[PDB]
Amino acid sequence: DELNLLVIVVDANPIWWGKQALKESQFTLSKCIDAVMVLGNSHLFMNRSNKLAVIASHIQESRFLYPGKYELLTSANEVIVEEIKDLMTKSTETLLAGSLAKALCYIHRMNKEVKDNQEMKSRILVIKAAEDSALQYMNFMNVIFAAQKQNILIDACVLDSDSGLLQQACDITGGLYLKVPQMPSLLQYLLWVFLPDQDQRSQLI
Amino acid sequence: YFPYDYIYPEQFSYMRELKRTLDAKGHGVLEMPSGTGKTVSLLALIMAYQRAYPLEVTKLIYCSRTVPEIEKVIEELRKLLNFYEKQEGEKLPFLGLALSSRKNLCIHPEVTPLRFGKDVDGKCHSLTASYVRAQYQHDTSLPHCRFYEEFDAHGREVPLPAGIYNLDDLKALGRRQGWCPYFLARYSILHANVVVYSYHYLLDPKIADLVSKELARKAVVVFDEAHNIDNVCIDSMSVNLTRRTLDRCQGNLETLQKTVLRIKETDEQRLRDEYRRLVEGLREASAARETDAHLANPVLPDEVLQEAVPGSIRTAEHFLGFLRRLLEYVKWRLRVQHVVQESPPAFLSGLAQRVCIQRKPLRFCAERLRSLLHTLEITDLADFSPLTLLANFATLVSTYAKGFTIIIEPFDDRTPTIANPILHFSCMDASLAIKPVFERFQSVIITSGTLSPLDIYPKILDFHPVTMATFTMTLARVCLCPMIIGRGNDQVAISSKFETREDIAVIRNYGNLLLEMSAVVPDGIVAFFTSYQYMESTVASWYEQGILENIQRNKLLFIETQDGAETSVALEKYQEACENGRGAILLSVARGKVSEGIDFVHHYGRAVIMFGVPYVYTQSRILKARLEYLRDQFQIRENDFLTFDAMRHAAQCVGRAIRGKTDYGLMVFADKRFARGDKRGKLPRWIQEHLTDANLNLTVDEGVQVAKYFLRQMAQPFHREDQL
Amino acid sequence: MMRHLYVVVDGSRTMEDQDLKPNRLTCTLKLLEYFVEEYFDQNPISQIGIIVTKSKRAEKLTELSGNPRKHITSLKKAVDMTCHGEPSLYNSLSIAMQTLKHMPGHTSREVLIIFSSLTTCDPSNIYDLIKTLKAAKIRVSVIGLSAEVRVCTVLARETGGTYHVILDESHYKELLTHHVSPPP
């Protein structure tokens, strides 16, 4: 009866999808959103008592998306499509910085709100497609420290090319760092992450 | 109008109080809530009346009761001078005269460091106006009292000195350009604004010290800390006499016999010539400082008469009248000192039946004594003083004794056998010494940090237009905590109602309280006791028995002793032990002089205990004569005045604890008898605002918990107060 | 703004007296365990050390360092202290002077005195240390416990630190929390 949360971060860089619009394998935007859909759907497929939340960090904002198994996931799907369309209709480090700030405060809110035995684990994942710049060193650092001081594991995945601050996030917090070349292979390895690295990081891998 | 910051407020109160005492030309009784700097407000508003003139003649003589407080008054009005001297811009001159006579006198090294005051001033005046008035010019004989002659020079001249001076300002000026305190005191009395000196100087009819010219149009005088008015007047006009003193007087009479015999013409022909000049015209033979060195007026509103020298023709027969007086007087003394008596007119009238002449040489013995040595001008004042005492006594007994009493008490006053015989001649009219001070002046102001029952003003008897208990709120949440300690648990006898020291379980509960008191309370504690002899008993049962060492486990005792030296030693140790790491409690006696002047401020000694009840011990017969003459006033008084003076001693002792608002004040009455006695004598504002919500029968340990709460909540905060 | 704090705890028989958790050293010790943990939670760039005032002495108990487990193990061992003898501020300030004369003075040097507000029993006049440490610029802030001692006030006013006395153990936490943040 581990009241387990999972929180996810998705990039929303139109420059990065313009990079990923001239490619040969050509996974789409909706392909990665379906990937994250499947991540969340898999973790809620794990048990009822697991909850979950996803953001897509907008250039100008950050709006979160969170949800009879099939219908729960379908409501999630519809919410996800709707705000993903909102992001595609309303559009670098600011995006994801302010999003992870929103994230921690939403973990605070979800922790403060619904606790019964006050039992919990607030695990979070992060997917960043492109680079994360050091124009806000203090903010990113501060957020990683607040994440450690809230006892929260931060896992991470990079798609295109490595950034410093994400690697340092991984190092300080205690969650793994990931980067796979082939992209649907990376999607199914995120599935391997959400299963093993979320539940039973113990004897796994 | 001098606020210098925003006030308690007190100037909001005393501004209106003083405007009421100055519109209506009247006496007035003020009351100080002890955290007030009464000194600041009084001196300020008085100076405000100095620099204005709705009345053109404007004075202030201001007193106090201790030689340090004189200096304290000085410095604080130096501060007052400074502030709106700067603010008002252009400076108009000033003078405040600290007129200290006795021990603050002489710059000659031969004279100065002999310890006492009176005798050494006799050496001074014997040198100045007895050796250098008789041998008026000599090398060796007239000694170098050179700056008296400098006074001669600048008393012919007119300087203008600067402002109000310290005591040591005038000694440093002694060195430089302001030389004698006495004679520059004279020249500066010729014109001064504010003159501050001791309360005992102004009301003393042993030697009535005329301060100023009694110019009765307008004159303003303020009595500071004015609690013990009755006892000052009484002890200033009572006269005590010992048979040892009488035998020194008999030796002195034989010495004067020798001096009369060895002088055959010259000073006696001087006396004959000058006495012919006095018969031809009534003249003051010594206009200079000799009458100040004389017993000036043992009877002040009574005349310097016309029928002077009534029963004497020459010296040695009047000397024989004094010989008859002493021999018949020691005869009187032995035959009365058989058994103690109380009589005002019986002794004087029976002596009028025994001694030949009645009521005129009795009325002139003082002046004729002093003048018949002034024509001799050889006898040293130290060798002569008990005869001065005697003639002063006979003058008093002559002209006064109808409200006075005679009481003659040759026995134990806590002592061994009849080897110390002695009498006392006191007033009981407090009026007969303060009535001068009322009738002379425009207005005096009796100031008190303590005078709560204003129904015992009529011991002074007089008339009094401004009489209100001063109310001043304390937004520094609670400046006090009275906490009266009667055991519920160990079944209190903390009052000494068995006897003074007939039991000691009393004292063992006291020591329980003291040890837990020193456990909690920091910074030394000021432990008022009952009597010297009860403190002797207490300390004996403490340092003998189980108690004392655990107190000595914590802190250090400064036990007073009956000198001024031990006062000095324990006081120096108290301040130097409380400004360091250690507590070191003082334990004293309430009527011992340590109360007056010391001012235990918040830096040290911030939790004042009364132990017992400060009543004067209730069986003595002087007090019975006192209460019978006041049963001739109000008839209920037989216990009422006892409770009155117990309370004025109590609050005078306890209410030193606080200097400001921002200040820490515990006051704890280890007593039983304080229910209605402290709903009388503690200040009515203090009983209403701070006292005994439910605290009357506090067990010590409850007292300790109240103390912990109080100390902890006075040590927790501070920023915000009555910004007024 | 790097700090070099020697916490000076007291071991008089004021640690037999209650108004706190069963002995005052228990509350004070437990909230010093919190203080170490939060002082490395906030200040890794600084260094601490326990000095226990005991039997008119002071005893250095843990060196000036940045290794928390030694400090907390020292606390664990100082749990069961009998607390013999009235204290002494003089020895604590002497130890602080000795070990802290040698550190570089481009940095703030406070010293936390957790004194039980018992009688300041010293063999030598601490007023002279209050003279010296002014010029030395070693700062000193003092938390008494259940009383205001005058000498600690003069200490905390010439040195330039902060003094406080405490009723609620919640309030004790309030003041340790205040001293966490680095004073200028």
Ligand code: SF4
């Ligand atoms: S007059 Fe002035 S100097 Fe001469 S004796 Fe008195 S004090 Fe000493």
